[PDB]
PDB file of all heavy atoms in Angstrom:
ATOM      1  N   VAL A 453     -32.875 -71.175  19.416  1.00  0.00           N
ATOM      2  CA  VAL A 453     -33.453 -70.333  20.459  1.00  0.00           C
ATOM      3  C   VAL A 453     -33.623 -68.905  19.960  1.00  0.00           C
ATOM      4  O   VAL A 453     -34.663 -68.272  20.185  1.00  0.00           O
ATOM      5  CB  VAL A 453     -32.586 -70.390  21.731  1.00  0.00           C
ATOM      6  CG1 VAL A 453     -32.967 -69.274  22.688  1.00  0.00           C
ATOM      7  CG2 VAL A 453     -32.732 -71.741  22.410  1.00  0.00           C
ATOM      8  N   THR A 454     -32.607 -68.371  19.280  1.00  0.00           N
ATOM      9  CA  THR A 454     -32.712 -67.014  18.755  1.00  0.00           C
ATOM     10  C   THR A 454     -33.830 -66.905  17.726  1.00  0.00           C
ATOM     11  O   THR A 454     -34.587 -65.927  17.725  1.00  0.00           O
ATOM     12  CB  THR A 454     -31.381 -66.574  18.147  1.00  0.00           C
ATOM     13  OG1 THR A 454     -30.944 -67.548  17.192  1.00  0.00           O
ATOM     14  CG2 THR A 454     -30.326 -66.418  19.232  1.00  0.00           C
ATOM     15  N   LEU A 455     -33.955 -67.902  16.848  1.00  0.00           N
ATOM     16  CA  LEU A 455     -35.011 -67.865  15.841  1.00  0.00           C
ATOM     17  C   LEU A 455     -36.392 -67.924  16.486  1.00  0.00           C
ATOM     18  O   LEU A 455     -37.303 -67.188  16.088  1.00  0.00           O
ATOM     19  CB  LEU A 455     -34.827 -69.011  14.845  1.00  0.00           C
ATOM     20  CG  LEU A 455     -35.592 -68.943  13.519  1.00  0.00           C
ATOM     21  CD1 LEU A 455     -34.817 -69.668  12.434  1.00  0.00           C
ATOM     22  CD2 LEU A 455     -36.993 -69.527  13.642  1.00  0.00           C
ATOM     23  N   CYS A 456     -36.567 -68.797  17.481  1.00  0.00           N
ATOM     24  CA  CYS A 456     -37.863 -68.895  18.144  1.00  0.00           C
ATOM     25  C   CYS A 456     -38.192 -67.613  18.898  1.00  0.00           C
ATOM     26  O   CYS A 456     -39.343 -67.158  18.888  1.00  0.00           O
ATOM     27  CB  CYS A 456     -37.891 -70.100  19.082  1.00  0.00           C
ATOM     28  SG  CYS A 456     -37.273 -69.788  20.750  1.00  0.00           S
ATOM     29  N   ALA A 457     -37.196 -67.011  19.552  1.00  0.00           N
ATOM     30  CA  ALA A 457     -37.423 -65.743  20.237  1.00  0.00           C
ATOM     31  C   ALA A 457     -37.802 -64.648  19.250  1.00  0.00           C
ATOM     32  O   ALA A 457     -38.679 -63.824  19.531  1.00  0.00           O
ATOM     33  CB  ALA A 457     -36.181 -65.345  21.032  1.00  0.00           C
ATOM     34  N   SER A 458     -37.148 -64.622  18.087  1.00  0.00           N
ATOM     35  CA  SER A 458     -37.494 -63.637  17.069  1.00  0.00           C
ATOM     36  C   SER A 458     -38.919 -63.835  16.572  1.00  0.00           C
ATOM     37  O   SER A 458     -39.652 -62.861  16.366  1.00  0.00           O
ATOM     38  CB  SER A 458     -36.502 -63.714  15.909  1.00  0.00           C
ATOM     39  OG  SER A 458     -35.179 -63.482  16.360  1.00  0.00           O
ATOM     40  N   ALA A 459     -39.328 -65.089  16.367  1.00  0.00           N
ATOM     41  CA  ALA A 459     -40.702 -65.354  15.944  1.00  0.00           C
ATOM     42  C   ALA A 459     -41.702 -64.918  17.008  1.00  0.00           C
ATOM     43  O   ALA A 459     -42.753 -64.344  16.689  1.00  0.00           O
ATOM     44  CB  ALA A 459     -40.874 -66.836  15.618  1.00  0.00           C
ATOM     45  N   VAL A 460     -41.393 -65.187  18.279  1.00  0.00           N
ATOM     46  CA  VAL A 460     -42.270 -64.761  19.366  1.00  0.00           C
ATOM     47  C   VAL A 460     -42.389 -63.244  19.390  1.00  0.00           C
ATOM     48  O   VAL A 460     -43.486 -62.695  19.543  1.00  0.00           O
ATOM     49  CB  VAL A 460     -41.759 -65.309  20.712  1.00  0.00           C
ATOM     50  CG1 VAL A 460     -42.491 -64.653  21.868  1.00  0.00           C
ATOM     51  CG2 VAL A 460     -41.930 -66.814  20.767  1.00  0.00           C
ATOM     52  N   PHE A 461     -41.264 -62.544  19.234  1.00  0.00           N
ATOM     53  CA  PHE A 461     -41.287 -61.086  19.217  1.00  0.00           C
ATOM     54  C   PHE A 461     -42.095 -60.560  18.037  1.00  0.00           C
ATOM     55  O   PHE A 461     -42.848 -59.586  18.171  1.00  0.00           O
ATOM     56  CB  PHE A 461     -39.856 -60.552  19.177  1.00  0.00           C
ATOM     57  CG  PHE A 461     -39.756 -59.066  19.324  1.00  0.00           C
ATOM     58  CD1 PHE A 461     -39.843 -58.474  20.571  1.00  0.00           C
ATOM     59  CD2 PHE A 461     -39.562 -58.260  18.216  1.00  0.00           C
ATOM     60  CE1 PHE A 461     -39.747 -57.105  20.710  1.00  0.00           C
ATOM     61  CE2 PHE A 461     -39.462 -56.890  18.350  1.00  0.00           C
ATOM     62  CZ  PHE A 461     -39.557 -56.312  19.599  1.00  0.00           C
ATOM     63  N   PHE A 462     -41.948 -61.190  16.872  1.00  0.00           N
ATOM     64  CA  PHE A 462     -42.708 -60.782  15.696  1.00  0.00           C
ATOM     65  C   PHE A 462     -44.205 -60.932  15.933  1.00  0.00           C
ATOM     66  O   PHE A 462     -44.991 -60.027  15.621  1.00  0.00           O
ATOM     67  CB  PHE A 462     -42.259 -61.606  14.488  1.00  0.00           C
ATOM     68  CG  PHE A 462     -43.201 -61.543  13.321  1.00  0.00           C
ATOM     69  CD1 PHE A 462     -43.152 -60.484  12.431  1.00  0.00           C
ATOM     70  CD2 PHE A 462     -44.123 -62.552  13.101  1.00  0.00           C
ATOM     71  CE1 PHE A 462     -44.013 -60.427  11.353  1.00  0.00           C
ATOM     72  CE2 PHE A 462     -44.987 -62.501  12.027  1.00  0.00           C
ATOM     73  CZ  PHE A 462     -44.933 -61.437  11.151  1.00  0.00           C
ATOM     74  N   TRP A 463     -44.619 -62.067  16.496  1.00  0.00           N
ATOM     75  CA  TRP A 463     -46.045 -62.250  16.740  1.00  0.00           C
ATOM     76  C   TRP A 463     -46.545 -61.329  17.845  1.00  0.00           C
ATOM     77  O   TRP A 463     -47.705 -60.905  17.819  1.00  0.00           O
ATOM     78  CB  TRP A 463     -46.353 -63.708  17.073  1.00  0.00           C
ATOM     79  CG  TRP A 463     -47.748 -64.089  16.692  1.00  0.00           C
ATOM     80  CD1 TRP A 463     -48.862 -64.008  17.473  1.00  0.00           C
ATOM     81  CD2 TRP A 463     -48.182 -64.589  15.423  1.00  0.00           C
ATOM     82  NE1 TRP A 463     -49.962 -64.436  16.773  1.00  0.00           N
ATOM     83  CE2 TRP A 463     -49.572 -64.798  15.511  1.00  0.00           C
ATOM     84  CE3 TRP A 463     -47.531 -64.884  14.224  1.00  0.00           C
ATOM     85  CZ2 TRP A 463     -50.321 -65.289  14.446  1.00  0.00           C
ATOM     86  CZ3 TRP A 463     -48.276 -65.372  13.167  1.00  0.00           C
ATOM     87  CH2 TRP A 463     -49.657 -65.570  13.284  1.00  0.00           C
ATOM     88  N   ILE A 464     -45.690 -60.998  18.814  1.00  0.00           N
ATOM     89  CA  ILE A 464     -46.067 -60.026  19.836  1.00  0.00           C
ATOM     90  C   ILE A 464     -46.326 -58.668  19.202  1.00  0.00           C
ATOM     91  O   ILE A 464     -47.301 -57.986  19.538  1.00  0.00           O
ATOM     92  CB  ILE A 464     -44.982 -59.946  20.926  1.00  0.00           C
ATOM     93  CG1 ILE A 464     -45.106 -61.126  21.889  1.00  0.00           C
ATOM     94  CG2 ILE A 464     -45.068 -58.632  21.678  1.00  0.00           C
ATOM     95  CD1 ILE A 464     -44.135 -61.068  23.043  1.00  0.00           C
ATOM     96  N   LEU A 465     -45.459 -58.255  18.275  1.00  0.00           N
ATOM     97  CA  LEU A 465     -45.690 -57.001  17.562  1.00  0.00           C
ATOM     98  C   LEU A 465     -46.981 -57.061  16.758  1.00  0.00           C
ATOM     99  O   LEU A 465     -47.734 -56.079  16.696  1.00  0.00           O
ATOM    100  CB  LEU A 465     -44.508 -56.687  16.648  1.00  0.00           C
ATOM    101  CG  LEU A 465     -43.156 -56.454  17.319  1.00  0.00           C
ATOM    102  CD1 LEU A 465     -42.143 -55.982  16.293  1.00  0.00           C
ATOM    103  CD2 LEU A 465     -43.284 -55.456  18.454  1.00  0.00           C
ATOM    104  N   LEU A 466     -47.249 -58.205  16.126  1.00  0.00           N
ATOM    105  CA  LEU A 466     -48.487 -58.351  15.367  1.00  0.00           C
ATOM    106  C   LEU A 466     -49.705 -58.199  16.271  1.00  0.00           C
ATOM    107  O   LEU A 466     -50.682 -57.537  15.901  1.00  0.00           O
ATOM    108  CB  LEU A 466     -48.506 -59.702  14.653  1.00  0.00           C
ATOM    109  CG  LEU A 466     -49.518 -59.896  13.521  1.00  0.00           C
ATOM    110  CD1 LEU A 466     -48.976 -60.886  12.506  1.00  0.00           C
ATOM    111  CD2 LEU A 466     -50.868 -60.367  14.045  1.00  0.00           C
ATOM    112  N   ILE A 467     -49.668 -58.802  17.460  1.00  0.00           N
ATOM    113  CA  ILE A 467     -50.792 -58.689  18.385  1.00  0.00           C
ATOM    114  C   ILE A 467     -50.923 -57.258  18.897  1.00  0.00           C
ATOM    115  O   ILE A 467     -52.037 -56.755  19.093  1.00  0.00           O
ATOM    116  CB  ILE A 467     -50.645 -59.696  19.538  1.00  0.00           C
ATOM    117  CG1 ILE A 467     -50.629 -61.126  18.997  1.00  0.00           C
ATOM    118  CG2 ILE A 467     -51.782 -59.540  20.531  1.00  0.00           C
ATOM    119  CD1 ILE A 467     -50.560 -62.184  20.075  1.00  0.00           C
ATOM    120  N   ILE A 468     -49.794 -56.587  19.132  1.00  0.00           N
ATOM    121  CA  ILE A 468     -49.827 -55.180  19.524  1.00  0.00           C
ATOM    122  C   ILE A 468     -50.562 -54.362  18.473  1.00  0.00           C
ATOM    123  O   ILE A 468     -51.459 -53.568  18.787  1.00  0.00           O
ATOM    124  CB  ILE A 468     -48.398 -54.650  19.740  1.00  0.00           C
ATOM    125  CG1 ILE A 468     -47.829 -55.132  21.074  1.00  0.00           C
ATOM    126  CG2 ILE A 468     -48.376 -53.132  19.672  1.00  0.00           C
ATOM    127  CD1 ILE A 468     -48.357 -54.374  22.266  1.00  0.00           C
ATOM    128  N   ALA A 469     -50.196 -54.554  17.205  1.00  0.00           N
ATOM    129  CA  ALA A 469     -50.855 -53.826  16.127  1.00  0.00           C
ATOM    130  C   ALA A 469     -52.332 -54.183  16.044  1.00  0.00           C
ATOM    131  O   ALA A 469     -53.177 -53.313  15.805  1.00  0.00           O
ATOM    132  CB  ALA A 469     -50.157 -54.112  14.798  1.00  0.00           C
ATOM    133  N   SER A 470     -52.662 -55.461  16.235  1.00  0.00           N
ATOM    134  CA  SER A 470     -54.052 -55.891  16.145  1.00  0.00           C
ATOM    135  C   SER A 470     -54.907 -55.241  17.225  1.00  0.00           C
ATOM    136  O   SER A 470     -56.029 -54.797  16.955  1.00  0.00           O
ATOM    137  CB  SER A 470     -54.133 -57.413  16.246  1.00  0.00           C
ATOM    138  OG  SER A 470     -53.272 -58.031  15.305  1.00  0.00           O
ATOM    139  N   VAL A 471     -54.398 -55.177  18.456  1.00  0.00           N
ATOM    140  CA  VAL A 471     -55.200 -54.651  19.556  1.00  0.00           C
ATOM    141  C   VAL A 471     -55.266 -53.131  19.495  1.00  0.00           C
ATOM    142  O   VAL A 471     -56.344 -52.538  19.618  1.00  0.00           O
ATOM    143  CB  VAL A 471     -54.651 -55.135  20.908  1.00  0.00           C
ATOM    144  CG1 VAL A 471     -55.501 -54.582  22.037  1.00  0.00           C
ATOM    145  CG2 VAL A 471     -54.630 -56.649  20.954  1.00  0.00           C
ATOM    146  N   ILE A 472     -54.118 -52.476  19.314  1.00  0.00           N
ATOM    147  CA  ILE A 472     -54.115 -51.020  19.233  1.00  0.00           C
ATOM    148  C   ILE A 472     -54.876 -50.555  17.999  1.00  0.00           C
ATOM    149  O   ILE A 472     -55.577 -49.536  18.029  1.00  0.00           O
ATOM    150  CB  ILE A 472     -52.672 -50.483  19.254  1.00  0.00           C
ATOM    151  CG1 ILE A 472     -52.003 -50.826  20.585  1.00  0.00           C
ATOM    152  CG2 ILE A 472     -52.654 -48.982  19.029  1.00  0.00           C
ATOM    153  CD1 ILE A 472     -50.619 -50.240  20.739  1.00  0.00           C
ATOM    154  N   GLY A 473     -54.773 -51.303  16.904  1.00  0.00           N
ATOM    155  CA  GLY A 473     -55.524 -50.999  15.708  1.00  0.00           C
ATOM    156  C   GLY A 473     -56.996 -51.322  15.773  1.00  0.00           C
ATOM    157  O   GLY A 473     -57.710 -51.059  14.801  1.00  0.00           O
ATOM    158  N   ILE A 474     -57.458 -51.889  16.893  1.00  0.00           N
ATOM    159  CA  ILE A 474     -58.852 -52.242  17.170  1.00  0.00           C
ATOM    160  C   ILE A 474     -59.509 -52.857  15.934  1.00  0.00           C
ATOM    161  O   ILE A 474     -60.678 -52.594  15.626  1.00  0.00           O
ATOM    162  CB  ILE A 474     -59.629 -51.022  17.723  1.00  0.00           C
ATOM    163  CG1 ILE A 474     -60.940 -51.456  18.389  1.00  0.00           C
ATOM    164  CG2 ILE A 474     -59.862 -49.929  16.669  1.00  0.00           C
ATOM    165  CD1 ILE A 474     -61.768 -50.303  18.914  1.00  0.00           C
ATOM    166  N   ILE A 475     -58.763 -53.713  15.232  1.00  0.00           N
ATOM    167  CA  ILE A 475     -59.268 -54.310  14.003  1.00  0.00           C
ATOM    168  C   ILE A 475     -60.431 -55.257  14.257  1.00  0.00           C
ATOM    169  O   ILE A 475     -61.213 -55.523  13.339  1.00  0.00           O
ATOM    170  CB  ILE A 475     -58.142 -55.042  13.252  1.00  0.00           C
ATOM    171  CG1 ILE A 475     -57.595 -56.194  14.095  1.00  0.00           C
ATOM    172  CG2 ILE A 475     -57.029 -54.074  12.887  1.00  0.00           C
ATOM    173  CD1 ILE A 475     -56.523 -57.000  13.401  1.00  0.00           C
ATOM    174  N   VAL A 476     -60.570 -55.779  15.477  1.00  0.00           N
ATOM    175  CA  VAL A 476     -61.660 -56.705  15.766  1.00  0.00           C
ATOM    176  C   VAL A 476     -63.006 -55.996  15.668  1.00  0.00           C
ATOM    177  O   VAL A 476     -63.948 -56.499  15.045  1.00  0.00           O
ATOM    178  CB  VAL A 476     -61.462 -57.350  17.150  1.00  0.00           C
ATOM    179  CG1 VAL A 476     -62.669 -58.195  17.518  1.00  0.00           C
ATOM    180  CG2 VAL A 476     -60.196 -58.191  17.163  1.00  0.00           C
ATOM    181  N   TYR A 477     -63.115 -54.816  16.282  1.00  0.00           N
ATOM    182  CA  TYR A 477     -64.367 -54.068  16.229  1.00  0.00           C
ATOM    183  C   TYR A 477     -64.684 -53.626  14.806  1.00  0.00           C
ATOM    184  O   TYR A 477     -65.842 -53.681  14.375  1.00  0.00           O
ATOM    185  CB  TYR A 477     -64.295 -52.863  17.166  1.00  0.00           C
ATOM    186  CG  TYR A 477     -65.605 -52.130  17.332  1.00  0.00           C
ATOM    187  CD1 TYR A 477     -66.557 -52.569  18.243  1.00  0.00           C
ATOM    188  CD2 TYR A 477     -65.890 -50.996  16.585  1.00  0.00           C
ATOM    189  CE1 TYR A 477     -67.756 -51.901  18.401  1.00  0.00           C
ATOM    190  CE2 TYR A 477     -67.086 -50.321  16.736  1.00  0.00           C
ATOM    191  CZ  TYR A 477     -68.015 -50.779  17.646  1.00  0.00           C
ATOM    192  OH  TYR A 477     -69.207 -50.110  17.800  1.00  0.00           O
TER     193      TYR A 477
END
């Protein structure tokens, strides 16, 4: 459970960086 939560948090941070970094545009 701790490992899966850590992975979820890591991907949440990645998505935060992706959206704030407006890398799509």
